Design a protein around this ligand. Structure first.
Ligand SMILES: [Zn+2]
Lengths: 89, 927, 56, 358
């Protein structure tokens, strides 16, 4: 019923109030996003948008949540979708 | 000692076995060997379970599973303390322990092994005012408790100890500048999928549940509130109650205000017989609760004490009798009690309900005495629904007509009265606020004055809110819509897009539709074009000059067949392939099509495209204005264009060829072809190399009596030669040409004298001459003054970006005093003027009643010069209607004088964008 | 997963119109665009390899 | 500055306080998301060539916000990528975010004070790296030049570059990961950021490194000596020296051409070709000392501040003055975003944010 995440000092508190949620296959999310947790931090700084992954539907769907401006959310979403499409080819 | 304390804690409160808690356990380990945090702040929305998390931390420590390296973990509860009391840190620590003063003295001997957990620190924002306070550094000094917390946070007291704090996203605003290098952790309540599943189970099967479901979960302000389990439960209970009441419930079933009103009013009616009022005492109690909530919201306060209840004549028994739901929870085991609403969203609802009941009586005689206002604002806007106010009328036995409704209407109207366009963000915010009211009359009365709208569509719910609110914008004439990446790539989204398109294709006063920077897929364009085919659509103007709609152009050629109100089409920057060109030409040839203007700037036209355009030009069409700017026109394409324009079947009246790469050969071809043309009246050849031969050929064309040219634009073409002799001789014997523009050509005083001499002839009927950045100097100002005195037809003269100087302007002002002039517009922007010439300008402006417009930007006027010019502007005889200035460049004195100028003459516009106003289609080519 | 690798590259905030060129970063030294890999790890590795080959 | 949301909130507040007693309007466009003001640009008298489109030049400045530092203001920085403003003074550095939709800010994101007790310890300069990942500070009586990492989850002092016994006057930073500084005695130390090891020391006359500019392998300095010196990084020898008619109170370099812009103490702007190193053009004189200069990202205009009340914008290459916006006192500092949308100027004890109208 609770999930914890770390908010970098540089991310405004005004931008955790309207996330963007999209769903995709779980294994695709594992292949693309990975698990290093430092690669993900670097790419978050680059896009200026936070990213989270949570397994849903018995491990067949992931709930990707993206925070930031609408433009930052669009940038992060498009990067993820491009990589995923590469995988699905 | 220690084990006894652990036992006491376990008894009071009764870990590390879940992936969530390990983060808290590990948050006190080095980041990269250079940093180790000593302060963690957990923040989140109300009701997500943060106090439970803190208590779990302490319990896990006492049991020996978390932070085992710490020697002591203290716990503070911010609610249950009196911040105005005077105490010392030692007493506060001892309160928790069983009066083990020896242990407390022993605790302070190892500060580096200490840990404080502070809970609910948000409530103290009202006392942590914008001011400094004494910084304590000892644990034995008696200071106010809020001073103790303020000193502990800044690590001036016990600087070596660890801290953990929980607070609300809205309380961080003053902590963040107080703590030193904190680590922030975001606590999130229910997941999105769980909230969706919970809401989807309580909608009525028989009714159209999908629409209400998607209108509930797509509202980000409502949906994000449902992270708290308590708010989700309230929403579910309200949905079930509305289902149970069947047709007895007339309140809205989508807005959160509707659900909260259902919940609160259903309880209030339980004691009463069906449809009967409340007593006077109960009315007093309800109004007092509402006033207390409103005052708490305004003063950044959310915990109330027995003193506050007395001020508003409240009692827990009375409140529990009114509502059986026990709205005011009582918290605090101390002999002094503390009260908090069941949720922080219920304080907003009761705060906004005060603006609706404050006017029914003189309640005050009975009583003894940002981001936090967003919820109250939404509730206040949603309480103006009439089905809701009927219940209040029943309860209070009196008509309810709040005086705030007029204020909200006035605000929404003030949004749309802005002059330099409307702000898309304020427009969307107002549309979100007006969607909560759900009252057709109030909404329609709010949106009366919206004559133009600029929207910015980012989420799905912006489509629904816009469709709802746009349906009542009857005086809407133009609209711009920016949709970046929402419809870019290929369903609820398509359905809401279709509804939005249907709403646009039904307004009767809508003339212009601009698509901004939208990126539309093929299917989105298909839906838009299908919806614009409607016979109720009156849209004349259509603009795609900044959008990417290449993949679905074929749906626009079919729209050209049917919609017969369409007259203007802009396709700038859209690549145009051969097949698309053929289809567009066939659409423009159709007898039903009525497109008069067609812009194809930067469309990458090929030779075959030019052949198709040439064939179109002679066919029977209604096309009158054509633009081919920024397209490379070759020799063969120019031959085809000439063969089209030399015919007598071509009725084109305007032609823009700006920056088409014309050369003297192509220009010769063009002007030779134009000799037989009788219909063309506007011609633009800007940003091309003409030459003396080209100017001579153009003058030869002008001489022909069959010629019809009225406007000729030659910006950035000519060369320093005798080509200005040809034009000068041609002007003196011309009766048709009215506008000539020679901007950014090297004319100079030598050619300026010839042009002035030609203009002085009474046979010349020229009306506007543009000489912006033409290399004139102070030598030609005498000729200009003589010509301004002498002529009878010239009405516009632009001399911007010319170094006339103070002496040049003083010379020119001798011809602006005379009453024999007829000049109405004068440009003097960026002419290197100073305060030296302000006397001459002031005299001319005072003594001239015909001047209507004047430009003065990019010069350097001092305070005294501007004061003289302002005194001149105030003169009764001056008739200036447009003045070119930037009022932000001058001191306060000059600015107040300019305001007085605007006051004395209410029709004067003082705006620095001087080229925005064109009374006579001056920018027919730039568009 | 090196932080110094990304300190040399830049992402344009403005989304490109062509959405197949979205996962590409521009070097702050030479201006070359490197990207298009199917993963975060591969993308960072390509950044490092370009740096080593061309610059350091 | 007045906005619509504040209009409504003030109206509601006034109504509420009115009901509890006895017992068109001009708005400013908001700075959306701390990124952009959604507006329409001014009209021009003519179009532009194919390739001249991006030769934009500003028309006016619109004031949008005020940041309430509570001490005399020395240096201002800003990042368009992260939307952070760094305002510096003697006591410390305050960090403000541009997303806070207000008209008078008083709550910074943080406050960075010096680990050494401020008594006889002062800051005098600050610098933000080009990629917005690092922040530098220097001043009197410090054991080094403080370095902060801004890309980490928390804001903490990363390292220190040792400069014991000196006073920092100017700072610079190169994409190659080098770090430069200039001291009152004329030294110019070059550190390595990876290892914090001193790599070079260029010793010049006293008060000659008051201003420092780096481009390619060159280090242009100028100060009260009134001469402009160029030091070669990989030869460590003064490769040039040109003398001017007044003290060099500021420097700047074009980001797209070879023009070096100087602001002297008597009020003149001089343009110097950094490659030919022969031409020295003079631009019309201001009436007061020039304390700041900076080229626009495209290099087609520049702004200047000084001991006067005005902020002036000039055009290249002729130095023609476009417009002028007044203030209340000497404008010590200013900065410009890398997208050419905002300009932030520090005067007295507060920093003003302006919107550049094109
Ligand atoms: Zn590179």
């Amino acid at each position: 019923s609770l999930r914890l995440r770390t908010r970098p000092w540089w991310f405004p508190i005004q931008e955790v109030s309207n996330p963007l949620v999209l769903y995709m296959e779980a294994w695709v999310a594992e292949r693309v996003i990975g698990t290093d947790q430092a690669e993900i931090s670097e790419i978050e700084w680059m896009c200026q948008a936070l990213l989270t992954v949570d397994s849903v539907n018995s491990g067949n769907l992931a709930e990707i949540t993206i925070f930031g401006q609408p433009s930052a959310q669009t940038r992060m979403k498009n990067i993820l979708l491009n990589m995923a499409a590469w995988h699905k080819e | 000692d220690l084990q006894d304390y652990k036992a006491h804690v376990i008894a009071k409160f009764d870990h590390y076995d879940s992936p969530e808690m390990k983060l808290l356990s590990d948050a006190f380990k080095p980041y990269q060997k250079t940093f180790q945090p000593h302060t963690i702040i957990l923040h989140g929305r109300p009701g997500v379970g943060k106090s439970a998390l803190a208590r779990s931390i302490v319990l896990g420590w006492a049991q020996g599973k978390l932070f085992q390296k710490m020697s002591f973990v203290i716990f503070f509860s911010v609610r249950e303390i009196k911040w105005t009391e005077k105490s010392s840190l030692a007493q506060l620590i001892a309160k928790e322990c069983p009066d083990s003063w020896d242990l407390v003295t022993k605790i302070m001997s190892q500060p580096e092994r200490l840990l404080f957990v502070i809970d609910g620190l948000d409530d103290m924002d009202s006392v942590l005012q914008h001011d400094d306070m004494t910084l304590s550094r000892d644990w034995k000094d008696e200071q106010p408790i809020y001073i103790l917390m303020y000193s502990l946070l800044r690590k001036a007291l016990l600087p070596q100890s660890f801290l953990i704090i929980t607070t609300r996203n809205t309380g961080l605003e003053k902590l963040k500048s107080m703590v030193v290098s904190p680590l922030y952790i975001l606590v999130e309540g229910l997941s999105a999928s769980r909230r969706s599943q919970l809401v989807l189970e309580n909608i009525s099967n028989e009714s159209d549940r999908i629409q209400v479901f998607h209108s509930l979960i797509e509202n980000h302000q409502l949906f994000d509130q449902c992270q708290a389990p308590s708010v989700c439960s309230l929403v579910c209970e309200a949905l079930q109650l509305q289902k149970k009441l069947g047709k007895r419930c007339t309140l809205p079933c989508q807005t959160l205000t509707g659900l909260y009103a259902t919940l609160v009013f259903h309880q209030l009616t339980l004691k009463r017989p069906s449809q009967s009022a409340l007593s006077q005492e109960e009315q007093i109690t309800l109004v007092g609760l509402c006033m207390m909530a409103a005052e708490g919201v305004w003063t950044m306060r959310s915990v109330f004490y027995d003193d506050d209840l007395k001020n508003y004549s409240l009692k827990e028994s009375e409140i529990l009798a009114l509502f059986h739901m026990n709205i005011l929870l009582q918290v605090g085991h101390n002999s002094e009690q503390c009260y908090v609403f069941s949720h922080l969203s219920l304080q907003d609802f009761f705060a906004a309900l005060y603006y609706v009941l404050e006017g029914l009586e003189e309640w005050n005689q009975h009583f003894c005495f940002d981001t936090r206002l967003l919820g109250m604002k939404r509730f206040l806007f949603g309480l103006m629904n009439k089905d809701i106010l009927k219940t209040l009328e029943v309860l209070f036995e009196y008509p309810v007509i709040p005086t705030v409704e007029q204020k909200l209407q006035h605000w929404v109207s003030l949004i749309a009265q802005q002059v330099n366009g409307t702000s898309p963000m304020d427009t969307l915010d107002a549309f979100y606020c007006l969607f909560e009211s759900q009252d057709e009359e109030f909404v329609g009365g709010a949106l009366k004055r919206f004559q133009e709208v600029w929207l910015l569509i980012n989420q799905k719910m912006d489509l629904k809110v816009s469709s709802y609110c746009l349906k009542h914008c009857q005086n809407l004439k133009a609209i711009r819509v920016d949709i970046r990446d929402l419809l870019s790539v290929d369903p609820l989204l398509m359905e809401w897009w279709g509804n939005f398109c249907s709403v646009l294709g039904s307004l009767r006063n809508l003339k212009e539709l601009d698509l901004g920077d939208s990126i539309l897929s093929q299917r989105a364009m298909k839906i838009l074009c299908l919806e614009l085919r409607n016979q109720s659509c009156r849209i004349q103007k259509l603009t795609f000059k900044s959008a990417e709609v290449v993949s679905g152009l074929k749906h626009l050629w079919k729209l050209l067949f049917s919609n017969q109100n369409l007259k203007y089409l802009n396709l700038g920057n859209t690549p145009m392939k051969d097949d698309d060109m053929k289809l567009a030409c066939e659409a423009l040839k159709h007898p039903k099509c009525s497109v008069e203007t067609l812009r194809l700037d930067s469309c990458e036209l090929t030779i075959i495209g030019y052949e198709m355009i040439s064939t179109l030009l002679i066919s029977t069409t209604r096309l009158k204005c054509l633009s081919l700017a920024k397209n490379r026109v070759g020799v063969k394409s120019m031959i085809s264009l000439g063969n089209a324009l030399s015919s007598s079947m071509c009725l084109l009246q305007k032609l823009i060829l700006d920056n088409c790469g014309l050369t003297p050969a192509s220009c010769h071809l063009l002007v030779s072809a134009l000799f037989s043309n009788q219909n063309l009246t506007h011609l633009c050849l800007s940003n091309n190399s003409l030459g003396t031969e080209g100017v001579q050929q153009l003058c030869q064309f002008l001489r022909n009596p069959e010629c019809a040219l009225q406007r000729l634009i030659l910006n950035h073409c000519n060369i320093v030669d005798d080509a200005y002799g040809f034009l000068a001789m041609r002007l003196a014997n011309n009766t048709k040409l009215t506008h000539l523009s020679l901007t950014m050509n090297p004319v100079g005083d030598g050619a300026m004298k010839l042009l002035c001499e030609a203009l002085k002839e009474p046979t010349c009927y020229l009306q506007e001459l543009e000489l912006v950045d033409c290399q004139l100097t102070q030598n030609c100002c005498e000729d200009l003054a003589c010509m301004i005195t002498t002529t009878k037809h010239l009405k516009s003269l632009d001399l911007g970006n010319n170094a006339l100087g103070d002496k040049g302007v003083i010379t020119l002002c001798e011809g602006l005093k005379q009453s024999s002039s007829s000049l109405r517009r004068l440009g003097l922007g960026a002419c290197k003027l100073t305060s030296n010439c302000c006397e001459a300008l002031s005299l001319a402006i005072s003594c001239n009643p015909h001047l209507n417009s004047l430009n003065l930007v990019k010069n350097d006027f001092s305070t005294s010069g501007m004061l003289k010019l302002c005194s001149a502007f105030q003169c009764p005889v001056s008739n200036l209607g447009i003045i070119g200035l930037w009022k932000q460049e001058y001191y306060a004195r000059v600015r107040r004088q300019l305001e007085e100028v605007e006051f004395v003459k209410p029709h004067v516009v003082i705006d620095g964008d001087w080229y925005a106003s064109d009374e006579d289609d001056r920018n027919w080519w730039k568009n | 997963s090196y932080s110094e690798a990304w300190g040399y590259f830049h992402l344009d905030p403005a989304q490109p119109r062509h959405r197949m060129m979205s996962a590409w970063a521009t070097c702050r030294l030479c201006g070359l665009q490197v990207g298009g890999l199917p993963n975060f790890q591969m993308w960072t590795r390509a950044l490092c390899q370009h740096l080593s080959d061309v610059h350091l | 500055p007045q906005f619509c949301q504040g209009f409504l909130i003030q109206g509601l507040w006034e109504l509420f306080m009115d009901s509890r007693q006895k017992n068109a309007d001009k708005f400013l466009k908001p700075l959306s998301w701390g990124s952009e003001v959604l507006e329409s640009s001014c009209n021009q008298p003519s179009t532009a060539l194919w390739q001249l489109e991006r030769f934009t030049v500003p028309q006016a400045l619109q004031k949008v916000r005020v940041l309430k530092h509570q001490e005399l203001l020395l240096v201002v920085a800003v990042s368009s990528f992260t939307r952070h403003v760094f305002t510096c003074s003697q006591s410390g550095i305050k960090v403000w975010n541009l997303v806070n939709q207000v008209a008078e800010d008083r709550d910074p994101e943080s406050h960075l004070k010096c680990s050494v007790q401020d008594n006889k310890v002062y800051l005098r300069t600050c610098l933000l790296s080009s990629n917005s990942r690092t922040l530098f500070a220097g001043g009197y009586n410090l054991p080094g030049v403080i370095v902060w990492d801004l890309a980490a989850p928390s804001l903490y002092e990363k390292c220190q570059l040792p400069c014991e016994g000196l006073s920092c006057q100017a700072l610079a930073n190169t994409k190659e990961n080098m770090a430069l500084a200039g001291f009152t005695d004329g030294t110019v130390r070059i550190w390595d950021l990876r290892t914090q090891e001193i790599v070079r020391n260029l010793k010049g006359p006293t008060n000659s490194a008051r201003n420092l500019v780096v481009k390619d392998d060159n280090i242009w300095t100028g100060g009260l000596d009134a001469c402009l010196r160029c030091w070669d990084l990989r030869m460590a020898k003064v490769s040039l020296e040109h003398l001017f008619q007044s003290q060099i109170m500021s420097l700047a370099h074009s980001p797209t051409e070879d023009w070096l812009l100087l602001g002297l103490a008597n009020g003149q702007h001089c343009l110097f070709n950094s490659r030919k190193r022969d031409q020295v053009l003079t631009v019309d004189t201001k009436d007061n000392t020039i304390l700041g200069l900076k080229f626009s990202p495209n290099g087609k205009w520049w702004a200047s501040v000084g001991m006067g009340n005005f902020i002036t914008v000039h055009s290249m290459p002729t130095g023609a003055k476009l417009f002028q916006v007044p203030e209340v006192g000497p404008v010590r500092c200013f900065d410009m975003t890398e997208n050419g949308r905002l300009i932030i100027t520090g005067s007295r004890d507060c920093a003003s944010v302006y919107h550049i109208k094109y």
